Amino acid sequence: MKVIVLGSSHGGYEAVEELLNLHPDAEIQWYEKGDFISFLSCGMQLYLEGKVKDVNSVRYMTGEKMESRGVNVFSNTEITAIQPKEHQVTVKDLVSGEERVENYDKLIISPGAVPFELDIPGKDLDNIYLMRGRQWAIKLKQKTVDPEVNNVVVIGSGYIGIEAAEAFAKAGKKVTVIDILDRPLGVYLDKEFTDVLTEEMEANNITIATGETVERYEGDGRVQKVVTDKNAYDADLVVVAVGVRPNTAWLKGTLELHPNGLIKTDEYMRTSEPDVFAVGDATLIKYNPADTEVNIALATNARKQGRFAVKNLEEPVKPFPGVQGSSGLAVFDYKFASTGINEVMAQKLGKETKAVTVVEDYLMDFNPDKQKAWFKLVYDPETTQILGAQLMSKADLTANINAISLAIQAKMTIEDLAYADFFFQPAFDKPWNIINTAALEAVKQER
Numbered sequence: 001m002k003v004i005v006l007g008s009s010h011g012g013y014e015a016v017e018e019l020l021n022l023h024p025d026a027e028i029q030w031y032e033k034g035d036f037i038s039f040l041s042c043g044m045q046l047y048l049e050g051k052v053k054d055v056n057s058v059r060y061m062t063g064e065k066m067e068s069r070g071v072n073v074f075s076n077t078e079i080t081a082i083q084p085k086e087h088q089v090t091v092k093d094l095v096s097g098e099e100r101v102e103n104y105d106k107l108i109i110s111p112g113a114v115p116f117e118l119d120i121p122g123k124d125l126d127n128i129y130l131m132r133g134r135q136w137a138i139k140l141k142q143k144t145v146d147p148e149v150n151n152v153v154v155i156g157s158g159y160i161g162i163e164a165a166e167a168f169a170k171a172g173k174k175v176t177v178i179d180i181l182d183r184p185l186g187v188y189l190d191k192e193f194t195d196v197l198t199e200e201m202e203a204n205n206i207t208i209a210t211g212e213t214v215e216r217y218e219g220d221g222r223v224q225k226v227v228t229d230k231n232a233y234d235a236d237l238v239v240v241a242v243g244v245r246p247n248t249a250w251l252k253g254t255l256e257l258h259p260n261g262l263i264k265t266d267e268y269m270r271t272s273e274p275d276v277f278a279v280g281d282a283t284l285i286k287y288n289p290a291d292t293e294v295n296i297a298l299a300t301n302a303r304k305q306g307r308f309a310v311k312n313l314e315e316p317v318k319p320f321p322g323v324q325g326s327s328g329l330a331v332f333d334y335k336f337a338s339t340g341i342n343e344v345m346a347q348k349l350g351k352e353t354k355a356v357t358v359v360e361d362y363l364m365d366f367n368p369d370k371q372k373a374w375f376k377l378v379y380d381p382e383t384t385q386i387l388g389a390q391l392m393s394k395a396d397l398t399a400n401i402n403a404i405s406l407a408i409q410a411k412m413t414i415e416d417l418a419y420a421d422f423f424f425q426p427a428f429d430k431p432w433n434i435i436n437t438a439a440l441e442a443v444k445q446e447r
């Protein structure tokens, strides 16, 4: 059986791993159009901030190691087209220019997404950078120590834009973050959390310019100004972190696509065509908090979909269990984590929720190490089933969100969590820990 896997990033990589333990026998070709196998773009912040010194070690696999395991790795080789009826792909070797047709028994594609660019006047003056992959990681690092870079502007106030803002502020630059949305990180966190985080970033001289539409980049040769509908900002460097486009225009006409460009797949990762499976950022995933399919571009999703595509290679036998959208990050001193439905998700989905927020020290009063923690529990008004939760503290309490993700998937209620058995020991928590305490508040509010 011959399986061709497209992409060496999180989705393609786990499809090769599960192929190796479920079909050791198979002939596996692994294709990557780029030059570097399995660079971890998730580790770009650690590298930019100097925590990791070698950019080439920010990876989780090499072609050499996969070849020791019997996989045929083809880097600098692009899949140009798929011919799904005859079960063939056309591939182009990018160093020699040679094209060739390859036949397959099963095809798994994880083509990913590309950084979205603002296509506005000034579009590319030099020093308007993107943040994805090795090459952009290297170029961004060189700018961190450039004495000519004093002002950096990042467009986008989501996860990636805040990682770039923190890394340039820690390198000693003045950073302005611009976005049309009214709060940074609103897709992950509600206003009581992003209000604290906005103060924290402003303390580290990051200006957050919310509610503005970038109109043009100005400059001579290279960027010098970013002008919005409301203002103009000096910029020696712009990082555009506004979002991501699915890398699928080459597939139009071959596979069914949704209007926004994402590949249509069912719960077995099957596309519209027999024997080709699609996984990763270019797909929708079952989202258990709201029982619907949502595009949640996270590495954890691509990895699980990649293994489920191999489980369903022969027969649709193993429907995907669905995910809660869990994410986590440190922003200067704060470590936050969230899962499930928050305010912006409930809006998008037209879902009504109730929520309690507790802010208090997470250790008992006599303990000198005590610190404030914020915890918000979101639940269904009718059933009181748990729908989401967000937590933040300068202490790392983030592993508690792993219990809430399971609570959502098992459809537990506020009462289940108010009395759930969580350990107590006074150097670690209070007799009713952070989850218990917020669920006890919710039970009282519904009494």
Ligand SMILES: Cc1cc2nc3c(=O)[nH]c(=O)nc-3n(C[C@H](O)[C@H](O)[C@H](O)COP(=O)(O)OP(=O)(O)OC[C@H]3O[C@@H](n4cnc5c(N)ncnc54)[C@H](O)[C@@H]3O)c2cc1C
Residues within 6 Å of the ligand: 006, 007, 008, 009, 010, 011, 012, 031, 032, 033, 034, 041, 042, 043, 044, 077, 078, 079, 080, 110, 111, 112, 113, 114, 131, 132, 133, 160, 247, 279, 280, 281, 282, 297, 298, 299, 300, 301, 302
């Ligand atoms: C800066 C940054 C920080 C992030 N941090 C986190 C984090 O901390 N936690 C988390 O869960 N997620 C994080 N993510 C999201 C995560 O990186 C993505 O969800 C995940 O990489 C998607 O995997 P993928 O396989 O779908 O696609 P991609 O990573 O986009 O990879 C697609 C791969 O396929 C290759 N390819 C595409 N087309 C072809 C072709 N036709 N022929 C051959 N090869 C091709 C591409 O070159 C690329 O190597 C982050 C993303 C970024 C950019």
